[PDB]
Design a protein around this ligand. Sequence first.
Ligand SMILES: *[C@@]1(O)O[C@H](CO)[C@@H](O[C@@]2(O)O[C@H](CO)[C@@H](O)[C@H](O)[C@H]2NC(C)=O)[C@H](O)[C@H]1NC(C)=O
Ligand SMILES: CC(C)CCC[C@@H](C)[C@H]1CC[C@H]2[C@@H]3CC=C4C[C@@H](O)CC[C@]4(C)[C@H]3CC[C@]12C
Ligand SMILES: *[C@@]1(O)O[C@H](CO)[C@@H](O)[C@H](O)[C@H]1NC(C)=O
Ligand SMILES: *[C@@]1(O)O[C@H](CO)[C@@H](O)[C@H](O)[C@H]1NC(C)=O
Ligand code: BEF
Ligand SMILES: [Mg+2]
Ligand SMILES: [Mg+2]
Ligand SMILES: [Mg+2]
Lengths: 291, 996
Amino acid sequence: KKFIWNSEKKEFLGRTGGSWFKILLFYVIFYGCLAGIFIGTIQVMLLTISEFKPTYQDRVAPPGLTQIPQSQKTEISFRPNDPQSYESYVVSIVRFLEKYKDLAQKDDMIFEDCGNVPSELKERGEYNNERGERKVCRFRLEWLGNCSGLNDETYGYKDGKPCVIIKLNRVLGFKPKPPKNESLETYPVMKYNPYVLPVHCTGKRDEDKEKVGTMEYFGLGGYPGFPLQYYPYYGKLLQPKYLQPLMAVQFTNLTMDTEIRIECKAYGENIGYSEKDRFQGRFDVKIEVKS
Amino acid sequence: KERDMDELKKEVSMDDHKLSLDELHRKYGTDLSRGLTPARAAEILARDGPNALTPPPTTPEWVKFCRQLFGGFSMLLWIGAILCFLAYGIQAATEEEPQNDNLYLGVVLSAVVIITGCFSYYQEAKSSKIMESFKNMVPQQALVIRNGEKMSINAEEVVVGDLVEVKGGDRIPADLRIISANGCKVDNSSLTGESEPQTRSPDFTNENPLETRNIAFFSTNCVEGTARGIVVYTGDRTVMGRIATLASGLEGGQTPIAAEIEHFIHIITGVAVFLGVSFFILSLILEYTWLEAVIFLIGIIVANVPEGLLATVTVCLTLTAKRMARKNCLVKNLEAVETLGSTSTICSDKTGTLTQNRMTVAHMWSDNQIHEADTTENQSGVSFDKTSATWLALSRIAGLCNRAVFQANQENLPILKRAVAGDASESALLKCIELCCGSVKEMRERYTKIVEIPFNSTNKYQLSIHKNPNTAEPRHLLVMKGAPERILDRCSSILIHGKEQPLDEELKDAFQNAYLELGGLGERVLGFCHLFLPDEQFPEGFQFDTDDVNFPLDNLCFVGLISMIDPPRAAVPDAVGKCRSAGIKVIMVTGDHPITAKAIAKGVGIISEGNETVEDIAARLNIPVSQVNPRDAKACVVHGSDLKDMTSEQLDDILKYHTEIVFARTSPQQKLIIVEGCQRQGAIVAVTGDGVNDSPASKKADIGVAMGIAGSDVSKQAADMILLDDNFASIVTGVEEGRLIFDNLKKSIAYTLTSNIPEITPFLIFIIANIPLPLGTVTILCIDLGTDMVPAISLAYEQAESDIMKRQPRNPKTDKLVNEQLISMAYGQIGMIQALGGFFTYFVILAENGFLPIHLLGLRVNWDDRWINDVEDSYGQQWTYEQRKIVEFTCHTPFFVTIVVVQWADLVICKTRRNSVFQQGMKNKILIFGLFEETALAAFLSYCPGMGVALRMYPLKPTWWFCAFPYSLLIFVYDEVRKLIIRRRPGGWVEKETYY
Ligand SMILES: *[C@@]1(O)O[C@H](CO)[C@@H](O[C@@]2(O)O[C@H](CO)[C@@H](O)[C@H](O)[C@H]2NC(C)=O)[C@H](O)[C@H]1NC(C)=O
Ligand SMILES: CC(C)CCC[C@@H](C)[C@H]1CC[C@H]2[C@@H]3CC=C4C[C@@H](O)CC[C@]4(C)[C@H]3CC[C@]12C
Ligand SMILES: *[C@@]1(O)O[C@H](CO)[C@@H](O)[C@H](O)[C@H]1NC(C)=O
Ligand SMILES: *[C@@]1(O)O[C@H](CO)[C@@H](O)[C@H](O)[C@H]1NC(C)=O
Ligand code: BEF
Ligand SMILES: [Mg+2]
Ligand SMILES: [Mg+2]
Ligand SMILES: [Mg+2]
């Protein structure tokens, strides 16, 4: 059957050279015309969306609750002695924090010291490029209490009793709300309420609760809360390198060489959760420090 | 060694007939007239077994299931299913908590085939089911005389070397030799297609075993007269059984439809491997792991396989058949429906198939003029003028001279379709009166006979003499019916317009001239004369003589001539012409005598008037036959005797260089050789038959056909098509449908195929550019097997673009079902537009939620991770795993919708191959409905509670629906102008490529 390539007519693969060219021209022109159309349609679509804001934000209404040492299974297992064992977890913590030293926070216009106390949310105008490049509120590494403490606390972290910190997903224009004054659902570990966003963590099950002896969270104001003044985040482009608020926790008399599970729950009215997204404003983690 | 057994069956029949009476005895040792002893009989019954044909091997119902589960198209789907699991297995071990998508594909794929299979078998069962409903045949007791004790026995109980009295109305028990005869004639039409009953004689007549009257045949019956004879061949040994055994043990041949599938299959996989291999190359070039690369190749090849097309084709095929069954055209095998359209050449039988296998009054000659009686089965024919009194003076002779009458049981049965005893010739005469000249029952008794004359071998003549009830002339009347030459001697006067006239010689020439013309026509010729018998010269009361000849034999008053022949069916002539109009070749094969055949083809359109057979040219010049060159004769006749000494090569020559062509005196075996000779051209040939002589051809035919009642049961089974109504015109309807379904399949095939380009496309770029997956595997299923089907089925209902009958037969080596052209139109161009729109929609959504197209590159890796939950967009927000996944799912769903929107245009454009949308118009109601069914379904699929939970398909924001509207409209524009561009340009390059 292998005579298709050539014949007396010498049609190439059964098609004459002249036709071969004719198909090519038409196909090329057609494909070219097709591509041009599609792109032009896309160009329109660009013009529909303003650079400053997204057109649909419905799917981020319950915001996320990421950790810092993103792990293949939210599980931390390592040797309190072997650097290699805990190196991966710690490696990101610095390269993450790298953009948080007083060095980057240098240009006065770019960085404005919000304060050392939580305050009313720092509303900064109405979103537009008509107002200039808006301002960012500074965040000090020292607000972390003896976690990533540099002179005060060892870079080790994971030598024993490792620190873990929670970051709220940045959402454009999100205005955090204090938890309801009614405290039926509010376990009040923290006295401060008006300008702090409550963060608490607990063991997954009653047995887990027994396993974890104690946990300590260190934050601005000596409260386990996010700074209301910092929000609302006004654009990554609008505020290049805007710094996300960071909150951390640490553990004490834990049970080593034993897998245990920890749940970190954000609280407040404008926070939802889903039994299908563990990270949907909720938080889970498996942790094992084997020696 | 059966090829030899088959070959021996193929050979023409051989037998020993000529021998002394004593010699038959000296072979089988049975007394000529004493019958035999029981002990002798018992020995033979073990020796050869019972007198019955061996039943064809029963086929268990369970076995059939597997046939449709295998076949050809089904097999292609299977490997896919299998290749899903084989892929899934590789995937299962390598991946951790792997997605269950590939596994799902496989189960559904197998299920589709199993369903499709189960559905098919339901129909092919229902045919043979209801086919058994008319297979209610009955055993007939054998008539046997043994040891002179006249003991009739069961037909199976019959044994070799035994005596038998074949009385009139008794079926012939088995092939036998004849020792005594009293004019019994037998219907050899089933075995050898002899329209006229042939009389049976003990003496040898012709060398050909079939022709000689000494022997007898099975599945025939003594009609009139009686005789006796002695067994020769019984059971399987019988010629007919041999013939059947031959037929059943032959090769049904590959049907043309499924062959186009087998070529269709090649192209599908052929692009698939190239696409897959190329991608596998690129994938490795792209550095992805070998193990993963294999999965990629399998996935592309698998998803490239059509899914629901198998069901669409099957359903479409069944529908077409149903309408045929609505008009009593049944097919045991679903595939054969298309065969009629594909036929380039046909071969039909004369008796029982074209003819009604009933002798019937054809022409009449009165007052020196001819009057062709209406030959119509259903009495739709025109009639002669009956005003002349000569019709009366003629009609009475027939009504009274005939010996018998209708059976009492027949009541509302039509006059033509009612059984009657005695000679058929007499029956037709009884018929012709009963339609044209009132009734006969009263007419027969109203004139009271006295003495009648039965058939006499010596001094043959047949006459009677009855009384005159009409008061005008009480003198008794005598009627004589006889062969014309004998009749001519005994008549002088002739009645014209009620006046007796003498035998002028010129009139004598005219009667002779008419006799010659009718003989050429081939109708049996009978002449009728009646003269009033006076009462003055002969006493009005009792004055009769039976031994010494009293009444005036000579000098009677002649009236006219009546001709009898087996006409065609009412719709046969027009149908033949219609077939010729499609350029189809029409050829007649029968075992009957040439004399009868030649006229039939002239009268039915096989032979155009004025075309000359090799012989007519000789007659036109009064010259020896040998001289004229055969090329001059556009048509040719071929007697069977010559055929035996003929070489395959000569046939080829005989076929090409002629058109109108007829064979006669042909054995059933010889018929089969004809079909193969037609097949050797490489063309598609069909066959229509009535009797067992036609059983072998129908089988080995690409497709065989027969009559539901006037057909032989053996042949009935072999054929792939049964005509219940026996309406020959149905064949014309069949070709119409066959050509029609063909094109609509081309249309249907394209719609489902074009869908694959957008189906597959995301999966491709997804790997190439590491973007989020634009289309879910599950959603594809909702297109291939969900929304698209209802249109795909609707396409089949499309009416004719133009007069297909004008179109010549397609050529199987040329205009194939799925050419390279079709792929170019759908896969090459429309599909790319079809897909392009989906990507546009995909980009729009992501952007509208702040995921910018430029920014989506390489994003796959971090995207599909189940743990990273701070994924950043170009706007810079952070997203959790489930949310951005919900978006992807809610982004998959529009892709599914857009596909329907885009498919809408395809449904329209593929409704026509050439005509403009409105040139044909949207008149196909089912097509329309599907549009809504498809739409409504799609809409529901996105807005039912929790579809995003059960099927991971979420609701849709309102703008999205109109996303691809320009694209779909554009597709419409491109195709319409293209189809309208080839309307103007008859032979432009436009046609060679775009047209499919
Ligand atoms: C900080 O993380 O670590 C230091 C120890 O490195 C703690 O300051 C012992 O550890 O704590 C008690 C008070 O809790 C003192 O009496 C001892 O002097 C401390 N020893 C040393 C060597 O400092 C401190 O508690 C801790 N801070 C927090 C916020 O946990
Ligand atoms: C010339 C006419 C026939 C069609 C030309 C196509 C162009 C100009 C138009 C026609 C339909 C349009 C699209 C239809 C729907 C959407 C979705 C919406 O969320 C943003 C606008 C967008 C993305 C439109 C972009 C511009 C578009 C592609
Ligand atoms: C808080 O609501 O209640 C406290 C009483 O237990 C009170 O001391 C504190 O100031 C209140 N703060 C606000 C903002 O309501
Ligand atoms: C430690 O948490 O738990 C011990 C029991 O396992 C207990 O003896 C000890 O006091 C606890 N230490 C602290 C600091 O609370
Ligand atoms: F005349 Be057909 F051969 F029966
Ligand atoms: Mg026949
Ligand atoms: Mg067949
Ligand atoms: Mg598909």
